[PDB]
Amino acid sequence: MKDDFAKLEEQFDAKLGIFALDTGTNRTVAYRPDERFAFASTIKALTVGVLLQQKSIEDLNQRITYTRDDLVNYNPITEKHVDTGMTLKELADASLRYSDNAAQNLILKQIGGPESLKKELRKIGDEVTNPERFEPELNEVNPGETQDTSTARALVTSLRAFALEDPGKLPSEKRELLIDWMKRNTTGDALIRAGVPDGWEVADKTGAASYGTRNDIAIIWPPKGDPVVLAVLSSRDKKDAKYDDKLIAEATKVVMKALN
Amino acid sequence: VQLQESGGGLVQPGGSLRLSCAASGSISSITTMGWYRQDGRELVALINSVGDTTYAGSVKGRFTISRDNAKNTVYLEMSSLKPEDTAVYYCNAFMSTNSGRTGSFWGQGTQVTVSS
Ligand SMILES: [Cl-]
Ligand SMILES: [Cl-]
């Protein structure tokens, strides 16, 4: 439905990157699936995937102390707990469900920083995603740059790797945790969730970055049958551009028509 | 556990400095250690326990971070300093202690002033 996505692009003065995979049949929908976009906060879902490979459920109860030096531009949860700290579990919850930036950075430091995250992503077969920076500097991507970018195809592949039993890069109890957090996300109601059919469940992670970049990646489940994994990425021509979540919801509707 | 900084001060444009940051106390392990500055707030350089480095785009090729795991100490060598590098630089280490505490710890900050 290439002309359908081109028409949407034009309506929102934007560029789309789309990949969706029905995991039951391998039917795919693609539109610029290999084009780089700033991944923005979608990287938080993969960072937690790596945290979960490396830590036991019990070890997620370790309390992490931090200070106001760890606070960055957007700290909705972490700003409330400077005095006591937060557990790794609580930081993952804040990162995934509120897109708390300091939470992502603390988790990233626990796993060894952006170079360690990159190594672990390469180990699962993601040759594309390029972690380089912490939040919020990772949102400052000029189009054409490869630092802190990925593609729709690569983000779907990696998200599927952590979240689903096939290929299963997490054990079951840990998969369940990641899915539960993503299902309870608070930031995505106007994105992929707004473009799926009645009765579909959604586990998503959003992001927004320079050049009006607006992304959502998700696992979606029909009332019965196999899940779809999809990424809807977008950006715009001008550095200070705004975004419109409706572009992602409408692109999701086109994907769903194509799949069903 | 604490972080001790040293090495700041005033230098002329073009000059150089080395900052050091040493962790002390009952330390079990350290993941990332490195340097931030406030002009706003930005990472300057980070190095992990297996020697992987991250540098701010504006300093790469001029500043070198290194680490001595055995001594829990990180060093930031700064060369070809510019007036735009004038800032408070402050050290961060993500550490675990033998008492079972883990967290992001910070040094006191060190002024570097670059001026004729
Ligand atoms: Cl940080
Ligand atoms: Cl490390």
Side-chain angles (χ1 to χ4, degrees), chain A residues 69-70 72 105 109 134-135 137, chain B residues 36 41 43 92 106:
Chain A
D69 277 323
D70 292 283
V72 292
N105 289 345
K109 289 174 185 180
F134 288 90
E135 289 279 14
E137 305 107 300
Chain B
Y36 285 80
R41 176 192 186 279
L43 176 65
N92 179 36
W106 300 82

Side-chain angles (χ1 to χ4, degrees), chain A residues 83-105:
Chain A
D83 286 350
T84 58
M86 289 170 62
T87 68
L88 287 168
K89 191 178 202 192
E90 289 158 359
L91 289 168
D93 190 284
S95 179
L96 297 180
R97 291 184 53 240
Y98 291 93
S99 210
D100 191 300
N101 280 343
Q104 163 61 10
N105 289 345

